[PDB]
Amino acid sequence: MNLGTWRAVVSTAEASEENGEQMACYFVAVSLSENNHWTVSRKLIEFQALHRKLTECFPSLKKVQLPSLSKSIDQKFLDKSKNQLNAFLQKVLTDERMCQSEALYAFLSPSLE
Amino acid sequence: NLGTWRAVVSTAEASEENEQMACYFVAVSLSENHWTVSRKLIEFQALHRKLTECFPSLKKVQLPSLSKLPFKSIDQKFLDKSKNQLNAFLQKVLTDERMCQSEALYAFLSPSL
Ligand SMILES: [Cl-]
Ligand code: NA
Ligand code: NA
């Protein structure tokens, strides 16, 4: 499929809990290729899953370091991690091997509740 | 622009989720490049509900509905029949300029994470 190559930037980030586990959530502002914009909320573990999937096929993405909850989550972590996730999005969106996979469209399009 | 999207409800089965549920595979394409999503009857109904609260005119569009005990199976006749109504529904909302700008519809028809 092809809906053009999108733009995506992580703006706001949050730390909170789910299932009594600290989780980091990121609001991604998405746009079509240059009311054609929307925002999705994605957990760090969802970014990690996407990176795992894409990296199996395209190991160059190994060089892209993602944040980990191996450390509690603090505001410094949220700032750094949101830059790391933006570098990851920038790498994927500019890579013609990946930037129009349905896995990326699934990740960046609005989700059903 | 979702106004150029086509969505065909292609097959239907009874599926098990924890309740016997009616489930559909929807073939989406750009009618001006294709993918398929899996959607439960209740998700079609939820979409209709969202769109109808916002646009009460839609309340005349009739969806299939069930009143049954959760364990009770769904007959194949209802499943086959119900596809047509769900197709008519998708075509009506996809042709309304206002509704096809709805994020609810985009979430419903885009690939799922
Ligand atoms: Cl950044
Ligand atoms: Na997380
Ligand atoms: Na259902």
TrEMBL record, chain B:
Residues annotated as signal peptide: none
PX domain location: 3-112
Sequence similarity: Belongs to the sorting nexin family.
Name the record gives this protein: Cellular trafficking protein
Gene source species: Danio rerio
Gene: snx25
Entire-sequence positions represented here: 633 to 751 of 961
